[PDB]
Amino acid sequence: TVTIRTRKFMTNRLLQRKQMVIDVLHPGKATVPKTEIREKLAKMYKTTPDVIFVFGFRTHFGGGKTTGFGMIYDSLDYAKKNEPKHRLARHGLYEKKKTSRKQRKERKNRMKKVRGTAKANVGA
Amino acid sequence: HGSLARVGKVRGQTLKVAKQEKKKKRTGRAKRRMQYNRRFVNVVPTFGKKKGPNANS
Amino acid sequence: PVARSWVCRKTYVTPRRPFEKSRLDQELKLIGEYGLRNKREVWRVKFTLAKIRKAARELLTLDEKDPRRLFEGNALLRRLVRIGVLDEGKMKLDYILGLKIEDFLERRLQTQVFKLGLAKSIHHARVLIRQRHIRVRKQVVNIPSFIVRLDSQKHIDFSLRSPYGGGRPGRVKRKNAKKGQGGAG
Amino acid sequence: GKCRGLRTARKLRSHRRDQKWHDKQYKKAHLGTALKANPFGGASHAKGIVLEKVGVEAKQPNSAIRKCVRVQLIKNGKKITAFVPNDGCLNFIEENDEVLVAGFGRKGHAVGDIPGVRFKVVKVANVSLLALYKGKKERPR
RNA sequence: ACGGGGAAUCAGGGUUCGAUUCCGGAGAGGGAGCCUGAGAAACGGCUACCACAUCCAAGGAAGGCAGCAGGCGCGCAAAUUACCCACUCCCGACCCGGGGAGGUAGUGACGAAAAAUAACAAUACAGGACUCUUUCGAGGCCCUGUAAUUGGAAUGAGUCCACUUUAAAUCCUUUAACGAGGAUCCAUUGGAGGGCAAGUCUGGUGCCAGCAGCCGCGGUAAUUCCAGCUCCAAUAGCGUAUAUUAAAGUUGCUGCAGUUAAAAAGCUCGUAGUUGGAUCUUGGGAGCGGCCGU
């Protein structure tokens, strides 16, 4: 019985996307995962689930209703272009380097000690 | 009398009684209810004067 | 330099004499009648009334048909009327001074949940609010301070989710029914 | 006021300014002499080191012996006789112990039976003297 | 004593605070001098001196945490050598890189908001409505209160799968399952002579020990000490020291006092200061409402 009514629906031709506030009714059971809402919004708006990005859910106290924000892009080539990198990475289609900023900074300050091609021979 | 030698005289020489076993006092609004019942719903108009709660003349 | 609010104010004032028999025993008369838990819950209401009652004094100094008064005064009157404290028949701001602590205690959720008769006492009412059994227009309210808007009074009932409504039957019954079939064999 | 002129603002302000110095509570706070001669240097509390345990004879009427503690303050090197609270708490104070010391209550004035002792001992060896008296904390030795 | 916007208190006047996130100023151990640049007398630039201090093959070299953490010291007095550029913005040649600025967690009873620590019934009981009885007693259809009496129904503290949260997590919210009778899943903190809410109770001590903001209590029936029971107050808080505000009309402009309680100069003149007599336009023209009004 998990229902999705959309709200504040807007078509950004300048990011090539639909965007809307997503009101999800789920009385009895938990906050339904984003994947399920993404599939349930795909069959609603006659699109593929891959170009949909549905985030930032805050379940109202009592809990027969939650609210997230949603985006439906035109193509994945637009999605991958003009979407923040962390929200692509949730769909398992982006990987960032494991190296923490403490390593990158200690590398950067070691690289300033030496001049020229020796700057390459800092990290081995 | 009593120089530095008498320090903690009376504290030392009391028959040291261990505390009695109490059914623990209810806390919060359960207490304020219990206080309200002791005063404003129960008691009767009394001849002469109304007594204090700890009164044991 | 940070993106924090900081803005916060007290909701009560501690009274000057801490041991007026007449006050101590009138504030416990309030706590018993209306099932509050400490004198802070009473000094909270008294303080809200005192701020209302301060704002009213401030507007009665002003000349009649003053634009700031007429705007501010009607704004204060429609607010008191909206929470069920003052009457629509009596909305005139010299009545705001003829207004006291029982009128605000009557409009708090604990007392409405009791005086609708879907609770058994005022102490049972807090239990039902605290244990999230009651709701207001499909919103489960955990908190018995909740002042009930006049339009929003009739929409106080049990939660659809609570066993007092059409809800999933609770922990003690379900354990005693499972022990009952573990007792029968 | 004894000059109700409309153009008398400075005489009325400058008089009041001059006559505030004849108040005690003002003269005290608004000179260095009260804040300098203060053994605590205007602080609420002060850690000092016990250099002897001292019996002080109570006042004229009542007559006990009040068990106080001669203290060298750290911050100043100044000498203080500070009282020790409840029954048998001078038994908790070994000599040369760092004690936290507060006022007695009357803002640097002598209290009750105890002549020229303005201070009480609060903690001994950074352990609270109420906690030692109630037996909650044990003295670390 | 960085100033201000502001803070606390608060009848009306006031009094006190403002190092502290916004504005403006100043300084980078103390002074001083200057290079570059649109902008610096810059210090995460340089040059000396002074003070301090590091490395040294003793010839020399390097330093500036009142940036973020962290350390020592000083003290009554103040947190992690954490994660991140995703947000907010900033810098750059720049849709792309960088930012201890900033954000996110950790410590956190500075402080503020909400708010558990039980509710409900059947019984013994007791007090109060009624037919009735001189008194007792009867009935409980009506109530109300207390007993580690008994009975189920409760819901979250915690435990914990999952989702949600989010840069990745956390907390919150949602939600399977567990999770309460001494509901031991155990509320303290201070008091109980007066001021000041609450014992002339019991045991100990005997001007001792101690309490006691003040007045006072303690020398053998202690309402005050040391404990037991009990009761009161505030309550997840409550006590203490100190600054400070009200109370203080005990600084008095509002608003104090000055014969004797503290207080009018020995007396007079006298300049700035302060205060300063009366007097200088009125009648009607135009119009409305029921002689008076705009």
From Swiss-Prot, chain B:
Location within or outside the cell: Cytoplasm; Nucleus
N6-succinyllysine: modified positions: K49
Covalent S-S links between cysteines: none
Gene, per the UniProt record: FAU
Source organism (scientific name): Oryctolagus cuniculus (Rabbit)
Subunit structure: Component of the 40S subunit of the ribosome.
Protein name: Small ribosomal subunit protein eS30
Function, as annotated: Component of the 40S subunit of the ribosome. Contributes to the assembly and function of 40S ribosomal subunits.
UniProtKB/Swiss-Prot annotation, chain C:
Disordered, as annotated region: 161-185
UniProt keyword Nucleus, yes or no: yes
Alphabetized GO MF terms: rRNA binding; structural constituent of ribosome
Subcellular location: Cytoplasm; Nucleus, Nucleolus
GO terms for biological process, alphabetical: ribosomal small subunit biogenesis; translation
Residue location of crosslink Glycyl lysine isopeptide (Lys-Gly) (interchain with G-Cter in SUMO2): K92, K138
Domain S4 RNA-binding span(s) in chain numbering: 107-181
CDD domains assigned to the protein according to its UniProt record, in alphabetical order: S4 (cd00165)
Keyword rRNA-binding part of the UniProt annotation: yes
Residues with PTM Phosphoserine: S152, S162
Family matches, as Pfam families: Ribosomal_S4, S4
Main location: cytoplasm
GO cellular component term, pick one: nucleolus
Superkingdom: Eukaryota
Classification via InterPro entries: Ribosomal_uS4, Ribosomal_uS4_CS, Ribosomal_uS4_euk/arc, Ribosomal_uS4_N, S4_RNA-bd, S4_RNA-bd_sf
Keywords: Acetylation, Cytoplasm, Isopeptide bond, Nucleus, Phosphoprotein, Ribonucleoprotein, Ribosomal protein, RNA-binding, rRNA-binding, Ubl conjugation
Modification N6-acetyllysine, positions: K65, K115, K154
Family: Belongs to the universal ribosomal protein uS4 family.
PANTHER family according to UniProt: 30S 40S RIBOSOMAL PROTEIN (PTHR11831), SMALL RIBOSOMAL SUBUNIT PROTEIN US4 (PTHR11831:SF46)
Subunit structure: Component of the small ribosomal subunit. Identified in a IGF2BP1-dependent mRNP granule complex containing untranslated mRNAs. Part of the small subunit (SSU) processome, composed of more than 70 proteins and the RNA chaperone small nucleolar RNA (snoRNA) U3.
Function description: Component of the small ribosomal subunit. The ribosome is a large ribonucleoprotein complex responsible for the synthesis of proteins in the cell. Part of the small subunit (SSU) processome, first precursor of the small eukaryotic ribosomal subunit. During the assembly of the SSU processome in the nucleolus, many ribosome biogenesis factors, an RNA chaperone and ribosomal proteins associate with the nascent pre-rRNA and work in concert to generate RNA folding, modifications, rearrangements and cleavage as well as targeted degradation of pre-ribosomal RNA by the RNA exosome.
Protein name from the UniProt record: Small ribosomal subunit protein uS4
Name of the coding gene: RPS9
Curated annotation (Swiss-Prot), chain D:
Transmembrane segment boundaries: none
GO molecular function: structural constituent of ribosome
One Gene Ontology cellular component: cytosolic ribosome
Disulphide bonds in the chain: none
Record-level GO BP terms: translation
Modified residues (3-hydroxyproline): P61
Family matches, as Pfam families: Ribosom_S12_S23
Post-translational modification note: Hydroxylation at Pro-61 affects translation termination efficiency.
Modified residues (N6-succinyllysine): K53
Cross-link entry Glycyl lysine isopeptide (Lys-Gly) (interchain with G-Cter in SUMO2), positions: K36
Subunit structure: Component of the 40S small ribosomal subunit. Part of the small subunit (SSU) processome, composed of more than 70 proteins and the RNA chaperone small nucleolar RNA (snoRNA) U3.
Function: Component of the ribosome, a large ribonucleoprotein complex responsible for the synthesis of proteins in the cell. The small ribosomal subunit (SSU) binds messenger RNAs (mRNAs) and translates the encoded message by selecting cognate aminoacyl-transfer RNA (tRNA) molecules. The large subunit (LSU) contains the ribosomal catalytic site termed the peptidyl transferase center (PTC), which catalyzes the formation of peptide bonds, thereby polymerizing the amino acids delivered by tRNAs into a polypeptide chain.
Identification of the protein by name: Small ribosomal subunit protein uS12
Organism name: Oryctolagus cuniculus
